[PDB]
Amino acid sequence: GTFENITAAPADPILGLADLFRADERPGKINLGIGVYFDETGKIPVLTSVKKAEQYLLENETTKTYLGIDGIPEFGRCTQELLFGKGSALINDKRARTAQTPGGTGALRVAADFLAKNTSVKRVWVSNPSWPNHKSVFNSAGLEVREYAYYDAENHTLDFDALINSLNEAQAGDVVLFHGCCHNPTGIDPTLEQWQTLAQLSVEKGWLPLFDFAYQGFARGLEEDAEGLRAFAAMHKELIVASSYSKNFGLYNERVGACTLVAADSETVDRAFSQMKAAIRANYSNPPAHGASVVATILSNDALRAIWEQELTDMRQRIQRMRQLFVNTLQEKGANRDFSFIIKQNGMFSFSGLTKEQVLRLREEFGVYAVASGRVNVAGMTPDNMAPLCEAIVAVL
Amino acid sequence: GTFENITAAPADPILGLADLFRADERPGKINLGIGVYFDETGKIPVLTSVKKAEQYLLENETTKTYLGIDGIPEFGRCTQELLFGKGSALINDKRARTAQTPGGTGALRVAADFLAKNTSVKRVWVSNPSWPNHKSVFNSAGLEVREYAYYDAENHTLDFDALINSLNEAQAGDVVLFHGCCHNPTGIDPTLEQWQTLAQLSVEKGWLPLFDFAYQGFARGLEEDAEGLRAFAAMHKELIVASSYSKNFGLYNERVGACTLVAADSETVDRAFSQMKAAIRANYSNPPAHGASVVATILSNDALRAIWEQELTDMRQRIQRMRQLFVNTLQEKGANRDFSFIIKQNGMFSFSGLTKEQVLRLREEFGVYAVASGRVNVAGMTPDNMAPLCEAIVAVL
Ligand SMILES: Cc1ncc(COP(=O)(O)O)c(C=O)c1O
Ligand SMILES: Cc1ncc(COP(=O)(O)O)c(C=O)c1O
């Protein structure tokens, strides 16, 4: 038997949680686990701009014939404008090529396979903590993953001194991964000035920067959230950007992402991009059309784009109000520990500072589900579940 | 500079040809390369069943939240019934687990990654000739690819004796890849007795069968086309099926496929399937929903399924009329070679027998695009383009 010697795989630290949640029969459960946006009703809605775009596609699509390996051309162009700016020199010099991929995960995997097979890259540096699936994606391509320090769990801030020192041994030709904004899971991003410091250090040490952009528009705005990347783009010959539209378009299950390659000149990037397409061909051949067609339609239509931007602002602002309400209700419910750092953190997630033991208590005694690392999805909080949630947390403090 | 010394990849023998066709400006160009279905009009249509299912989805979808790693459950259930039949013992014994994948290609890569990372398998056997991308997929997962004989070019038939003497070099624990029906590119499939011979030889030699099922329904029928797979399934304890809905549903660019895992018992397949989900998680996380939702909606609704089964029947029969028309028209245009063997070949493709130089001549001089191996897409032939097509072929004989 070929399958007899197989060892079972552990449950995913995030998706295994959602399986335990679907089984729990207790009334009043609260899901603060997976990173999806809930509305004030506690539901995960389809955006109006997306429904409008899907109607246009239903009426106007005449064929489902294969896309090119790199996907919808307009999708790649609108992606580069979103990341680098409408009039970026990167775009005018034709230094960037973008492949449409199945979600942000697929973009990271395409980059990993491309690097492992066509470059001397052997090592990727990832923040500690980070998205748990980062290590698995790069390991799947045979790349060693090291960790650099990031979070000051005492002051609930960026430990910039430890970050610099821990990256001292990152060699020229190593890949260093940066969260573009809304760091997962800490919600603490570098300031513009810290970005500029990292950009200078990156060029001096010869790192290959890889930016993971899964939450553009959830911190401050579409343009502001990209300031760090554009500070790097102004100084580097080469970099890679894995972006995702799962969160900011609410297109999670349609798998809409992009992997953007940047090189010194158009001739080099075209040569490298041909090898990236070869790695896509051997993986999934060509990308799924529906989700990317939606995004390209919205971003190309000025009227639909204005709808989406307002819907994104509504999502970002509801999350910020839930942060404030979360802190206030914890006080009202009698918490003596100070949770005001929550209001400083950006995006969907925040390191609550709860121990694995307290997270386990919340899940089994109170039906409140969070990731074992203490990460809670603030976007899962509503005016209706806020008080029971806070009463449960205060109970385990 | 990390990208400066990368070597450009060669063009894909199929998709590179498609790019040349799009760029060609002559109005009379004929595309017989990529495996997509054309109607008598010369367009690549969307099936009516698909359009109706998409309209249902547009009006009833309330969320785009992530699917499970293995995708839509009903999709997996309906896939297993198509492959093994309604009352299969594999299904009742719970020996089979299916993961929804991005296309058939994605199913192949998932299986390859799963095998290379969790088993001792190191060698995959693929027919000569075969789909060109088979080698790329398995090599990229780190598996060695060996070739066994299949096609008798002299008699334009299956060389069942060479096939066997070749596969005797295949050891136990090796993976042997079989086209379930409509062999690509030859269109010559084993008979039911030859399948049963290979099945017995397979269990006797200890091979792990891997079936590529991209054209179920294009040879004889949905059930008839699965006879070979069901002969293997009745004897083996383990096998893998990579299937695609790109062709038989015309959902090429939505990437709808499945990877079905079979083990000796329910406990072993679940253990093995857990590692397959891990390989998926580190690739694209979870599969695209739109295409698989369409498939599951059509197969779950009796009215829609009846429409789809008739649309698939019309596709299969139009291709059969073009095979007849193609052979007769060649005689009328002055071909002295005998092309009767084309009538005995199944599916969309036919091994024309033209040389690489003749194929090159057809493209450059006559604007007729075929794969360099001489494979032509019969489904690209229409009554309108038949006469110019055959006139060009006769002119290079
Ligand atoms: C930092 C980061 N990268 C990538 C992803 C995955 O994105 P996607 O669901 O589009 O594959 C996520 C969220 O799941 C994330 O937080
Ligand atoms: C034999 C065979 N296997 C797999 C595939 C992959 O199909 P898909 O487009 O679903 O990836 C194809 C054609 O594309 C094929 O002909």
Numbering used by the authors:
A (entry chain A), B (entry chain B): 0 to 396
The authors write:
For example, the VFIT mutant from the Closed Library contains Val, Phe, Ile, and Thr residues at positions 35, 37, 43, and 64, respectively. To determine if these differences in the temperature dependence of exchange could be observed in the crystal state, we also solved the maleate-free structures of WT, HEX, and VFIT at 303 K, and calculated isomorphous difference density maps by subtracting electron density at 278 K. Comparing VFIT data obtained at 278 K and 303 K results in substantial difference density throughout chain A, the chain that opens when WT crystals are soaked to remove maleate. By contrast, similar comparisons for WT and HEX showed relatively little difference density. This analysis confirms that VFIT undergoes larger local conformational changes than either HEX or WT when the temperature of the crystal is increased to 303 K, in agreement with our van’t Hoff analysis of NMR data. The agreement between temperature-dependent X-ray crystallography and NMR data provides strong evidence that the conformational exchange detected in the NMR experiments reflects a dynamic equilibrium between closed and open conformations, with mutations that favor the closed conformation also increasing selectivity toward l-phenylalanine. The relative intensity of the two peaks showed similar temperature dependence, with an increase in the relative intensity of the WT-like peak as temperature was increased to 308 K. Peak deconvolution and integration were used to evaluate the population of the two states, and confirmed that at low temperatures both VFIT and VFIY favor the state resembling that adopted by the closed HEX mutant (T < 288 K or 283 K, respectively). However, unlike HEX, at higher temperatures the alternate conformation with the WT-like peak becomes the favored state.
E. coli aspartate aminotransferase (AAT) is a pyridoxal phosphate (PLP)-dependent enzyme that catalyses the reversible transamination of l-aspartate with α-ketoglutarate, yielding oxaloacetate and l-glutamate. During its catalytic cycle, AAT undergoes hinge movement to switch between an open conformation, in the ligand-free form, and a closed conformation upon association with substrates or inhibitors. Using our approach, we enrich the less populated but catalytically active closed conformation in order to increase catalytic efficiency (kcat/KM) with the non-native substrate l-phenylalanine, leading to altered substrate selectivity. Steady-state kinetics reveal kcat/KM increases of up to 100-fold towards this aromatic amino acid, resulting in a selectivity switch of up to 1900-fold, and structural analyses by room-temperature X-ray crystallography and multitemperature nuclear magnetic resonance (NMR) spectroscopy confirm that the conformational landscape is remodeled to favor the target state.
